[PDB]
Amino acid sequence: AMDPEDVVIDRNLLILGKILGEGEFGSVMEGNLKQEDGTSLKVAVKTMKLSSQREIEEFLSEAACMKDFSHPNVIRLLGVCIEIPKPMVILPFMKYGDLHTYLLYSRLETGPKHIPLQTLLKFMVDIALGMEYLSNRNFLHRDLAARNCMLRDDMTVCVADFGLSKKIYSGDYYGRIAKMPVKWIAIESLADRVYTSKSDVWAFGVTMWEIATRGMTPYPGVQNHEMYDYLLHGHRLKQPEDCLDELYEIMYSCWRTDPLDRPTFSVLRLQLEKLLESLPDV
Ligand SMILES: Cn1cc(-c2cnc(N)c(C(=O)N[C@H]3CCC[C@@H]3OCc3ccc(-c4ccc(C(C)(C)N5CCN(CC=O)CC5)cc4)cc3)c2)cn1
Ligand SMILES: [Cl-]
Ligand SMILES: [Cl-]
């Protein structure tokens, strides 16, 4: 581990806590990071169930690039701790957790109160702003979904889970790609497993539909194994109940068969901001 970009944090400065979530490709843990002035900082730690020195050095160069992300709607990586080397990414702790679980909790009496239409649109604007920033830096996210967007203590949404994210043209580091959820994958990416910025636009449309349905799984009544054939026949996500016709037309533009017919994040973000401006206060 040469690390010329100084992204590695001394492992001894990190105290691991409770596991927040576990999956086939890693886990998220609560943690404390001892700062220079002796005061501890509450952080989240993402581990990955993978190795080589060149693979870890390439991993640290990618981490160093993500550490320079400066946008309120994009999570900022604090550093990487190493443990055969086992890397763990250190992130700021997002109080409210992921947006998907938050939408589900909102449908319970004890959870957050009923989310107004305007607040749902504001979550979509936030994600579009974050994706516009990443897209302008030539990043492909490749795993955009409401479960991968986080809520800060001020209720601003930030795009997170950069585990499959890569610059366009860069080497594909990884397997981990082939096991991703089929219901967020663009039709051309199911047929060839190749992603572009237009594949992220498709996933963004799916994420807007998740927000508008308050956390429903995409395509009710359709099984994962039928998805490619379903999309090949021209079928798309149906309009949710109480979803403005204007908002649904923005979602449907994300799922045009030809990726080149789909809009960019800059255009989507402006269309959503204009629609939100045209609505009354809550
Ligand atoms: C119940 N509860 C939970 C909380 C909670 C509170 N606060 C949090 N921050 C989290 C929380 O963190 N939750 C994560 C789960 C999903 C969404 C969110 O994700 C964050 C996140 C960001 C960034 C990464 C990343 C991963 C690899 C990399 C490198 C650079 C290492 N890799 C190298 C390999 N390349 C290959 C490319 O193909 C990709 C990039 C760089 C960043 C990975 C994960 C959870 C509260 N309540
Ligand atoms: Cl549907
Ligand atoms: Cl419909």
> What residues contact residue 156 under an 8 Å CB cut-off, 6+ apart?
72, 73, 126
Class of domain 99-277: mainly alpha
Which residue owns the Cα nearest ligand 1 atom 30? 63
Ligand 2 centroid to 96 CA: how many Å? Answer: 28
Neighbours of 36 (CB within 10 A): 6
Amino acid letter, 25: F
> What residues contact residue 222 under an 8 Å CB cut-off, 6+ apart?
230
> What residues contact residue 149 under an 8 Å CB cut-off, 6+ apart?
98, 99, 100, 123, 127, 130, 157, 158, 159, 160, 207
Determine the angle formed by the axes of helices 245-253 and 265-277, rounding to 10 degrees: 180
Residue 27 assigned to a binding site:
yes
Cα distance between the two ends of the chain: 53
Ligand 3 centroid to 222 CA: how many Å? Answer: 15
3-state secondary structure of 42: strand
3-state secondary structure of 168: coil
Which ligand 1 atom lies nearest to the CA of residue 94? 7
> CA-CA distance, 28 to 44, in Å (whole number)?
7
> What residues contact residue 261 under an 8 Å CB cut-off, 6+ apart?
none
* CATH fit for domain 11-92, picks 3.40.35.10, 3.40.50.300, 3.30.200.20, 3.40.220.10: 3.30.200.20
31 vs 12, 18, 160, 255, CA distance in Å?
Answer: 12, 8, 18, 39
**Ligand 1 pocket check for 72: Cβ under 6 Å:** no
Q: Per 3-state DSSP, what percentage of the chain is helix, strand, and coil (rounded to 5)?
A: 40, 20, 45
Quick check: 230 and 219 in contact, CB under 8 A? yes
Which ligand 1 atom lies nearest to the CA of residue 75? 22
Residue 42 assigned to a binding site:
yes
Resolution (A): 2.1
| Way it was determined | X-ray
> CA-CA distance, 186 to 206, in Å (whole number)?
10
Which numbered ligand comes closest to the C-alpha of 243?
3
Tokens describing residue 90: 């250190």
Quick check: 79 and 90 in contact, CB under 8 A? yes
Per DSSP (E only), the strands in 119-257 are 139-140, 149-151, 157-159, 166-167
Which residue owns the Cα nearest ligand 1 atom 21? 161
> CA-CA distance, 184 to 195, in Å (whole number)?
12
Quick check: 3 and 57 in contact, CB under 8 A? yes
> CA-CA distance, 161 to 256, in Å (whole number)?
26
**Domain coordinates of the chain in residue numbers?**
11-92, 99-277
Do 11-92 and 99-277 share a fold? Answer: no
Residue 26 assigned to a binding site:
yes
Ligand 3 centroid to 240 CA: how many Å? Answer: 8
Residues forming the active site = 143
**Ligand 1 pocket check for 33: Cβ under 6 Å:** no
**Ligand 1 pocket check for 64: Cβ under 6 Å:** no
**Ligand 1 pocket check for 210: Cβ under 6 Å:** no
Quick check: 262 and 253 in contact, CB under 8 A? yes
> CA-CA distance, 5 to 9, in Å (whole number)?
12
Ligand 3 centroid to 238 CA: how many Å? Answer: 4
